[PDB]
Amino acid sequence: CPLMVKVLDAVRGSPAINVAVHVFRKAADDTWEPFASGKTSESGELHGLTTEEEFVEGIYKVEIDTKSYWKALGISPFHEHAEVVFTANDSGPRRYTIAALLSPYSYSTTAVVTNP
Amino acid sequence: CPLMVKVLDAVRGSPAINVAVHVFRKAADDTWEPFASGKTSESGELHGLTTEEEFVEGIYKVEIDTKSYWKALGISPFHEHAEVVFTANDSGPRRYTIAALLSPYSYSTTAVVTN
Amino acid sequence: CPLMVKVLDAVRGSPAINVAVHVFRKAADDTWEPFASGKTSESGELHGLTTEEEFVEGIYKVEIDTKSYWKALGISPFHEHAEVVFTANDSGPRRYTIAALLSPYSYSTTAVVTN
Amino acid sequence: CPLMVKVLDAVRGSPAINVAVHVFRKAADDTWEPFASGKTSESGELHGLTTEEEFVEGIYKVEIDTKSYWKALGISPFHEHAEVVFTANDSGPRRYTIAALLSPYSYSTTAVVTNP
Ligand code: NA
Ligand code: NA
Ligand code: NA
Ligand code: NA
C-alpha cells in the first residue's frame, strides 16, 4: 500500500487511536471525490487505504478528523479537522506516509515520501 | 479586527513574506464562500481581514498558499496549500491568531485565542 | 534588545504566562554561565533580557521551565525543561526571537532572525 | 530496548540518516555522565542504545546532533543540537520513543511512552 497515515497525541505521549481519516481525490470537474477512508489502529497507524493500481496521479486530500477524536475523549478542541492536500505520483509511483501530531489547539503534519 | 494570520519560514528562520491567504466561511449549503483575503506583510502578518461585526459565529477556513511561496524561493514543496478549519465561538470577547510554521514537507499550525 | 523569547501553550491555545526562562552563555571552559533570566508576561513574551553591547558572538542556551508551567496547571508533563542552544553570529544587524510551542509530551522551537 | 530515537527531515520529506545521538544520565554529583550513543540508520531510527537492566530510573538527556547533520549536507543551520531532557522509569520500567522533526531554523520533538 502506497499511502499510510500515522497520528500521535501530544497530550498523552501516545498513538492517537481510533482517529477517522477520509481521503478524497480531485475529479476532472474540480470536485473532491471520495477515494478511501479508515481509522487509526492501536498503534496510531492506518494501513490498507489503497493499492498501487488504484492510487493514480492526482491531487489528494487527507482529512484527519481531529475534532471527533478530541470530542470522543471528552475534550473541546479548536480545529474541525486537519486537511493535508498534495499532488501524488506525478513523477511515477511513490510511497507516502502522512504523519500528524495532535494537540487541542495545534497540530503538525509531515510527509515522508519514498521511491520503491 | 478579531482575526490575524501569522506565517513563519522554518528553512530561513524568517517571516514568510508575500504569502497569499484566503479566508472562507461555510455557507448553509456546505460550500465555502469567499470571506476575506490578502498577502502577508514584511513581518509575516496579515492584519485587517475582518471586523467584529462581520466575523459572526460559524465555520471558517484559512487557506495559505504555501506552494507558491516555496516555488518563488526556488524550492520544491510537498503540499498544495495549508488549510486551517475551525469554528468561531462567541464566549465572551475573543481575538484569534492563526499561526503557521512552514517547511517544504511539513507545517504546523496553532491557534492563539485571547481576550 | 537583540534577544526575545516567546512561549505558547498548544493545549489551551494561549500565551504561556509566567514561565521561567534562563539564558546562559558558554564560557571558555565549556561551562554554562548565567547570562539573563525572567518570566514570560501575559502575552507569553520576555523582553529586555540583554543589550546589543552585552550580546556578543558566542554559544547561548535558553532554558524554558516547562515542567513547572504544566504542574501549575495541574497537568503531568514529560520534559524537565525545553533547551534551545545556538550560536549568535554578527553578520550585519540582527534580532533573534526564540519561539517555543508547548504540549505536555512535545514541544517545537523556531528561531526568527531579522534585520 | 526501552529507548529508541527517530529523526525526520522536514526539508526533504525523508528520514534523517546518519544523525549522531548522545545520551547522558544525571549522576549523584549533578553532572551529566555519558550513558550511550549511536547514529540513525537509513530509516532515521536508532535502536539498541541500552537494555532494560541498564536503563534505570534517572534524569536523561538525549542530544541530537542537528548542526553536524545539516553541516554534513552542506547547510548552515541555527541550532547547535536538540536536547531532550526527561525523568525516566520513575513509576517502573517504560519504553520511550523520542522523535524529532528537523528544519534548518526549527525543530520539534515528541515522546511516545508505553508500558510493556
Ligand atoms: Na508527470
Ligand atoms: Na501566491
Ligand atoms: Na517556574
Ligand atoms: Na518512583
Numbering used by the authors:
A (entry chain A), D (entry chain A): 10 to 125
B (entry chain B), C (entry chain B): 10 to 124
Q: Which sentences from the paper describe this structure?
A:
Transthyretin (TTR) is a plasma and cerebrospinal fluid (CSF) protein synthesized by the liver, choroid plexus, eye and pancreas. TTR is the main transporter of T4 hormone in CSF and the primary carrier of retinol (Vitamin A) binding protein in blood plasma. TTR is a homo tetramer with a total mass of 55 kDa composed of 127 amino acids in each subunit. The inner β-sheets of the dimer–dimer (AB–A′B′) interface form two T4BP cavities referred to as sites AA′ and BB′, respectively.
Comparisons were done with apo-TTR crystallized under identical conditions. All four crystal structures belong to the P21221 space group; the protein structure remains unchanged upon ligand binding, as evidenced by the low deviation in Cα positions between the aligned monomers (<0.35 Å rmsd). The dimer AB is found in the asymmetric unit and the second dimer (A′B′) to form the tetramer can be obtained by rotation along the crystallographic 2-fold c-axis. Notably, in apo-TTR, the side chain of Ser117 adopts several alternative conformations and H-bonds with water molecules occupying the binding cavity. Upon ligand binding, the conformation of Ser117 becomes more constrained.
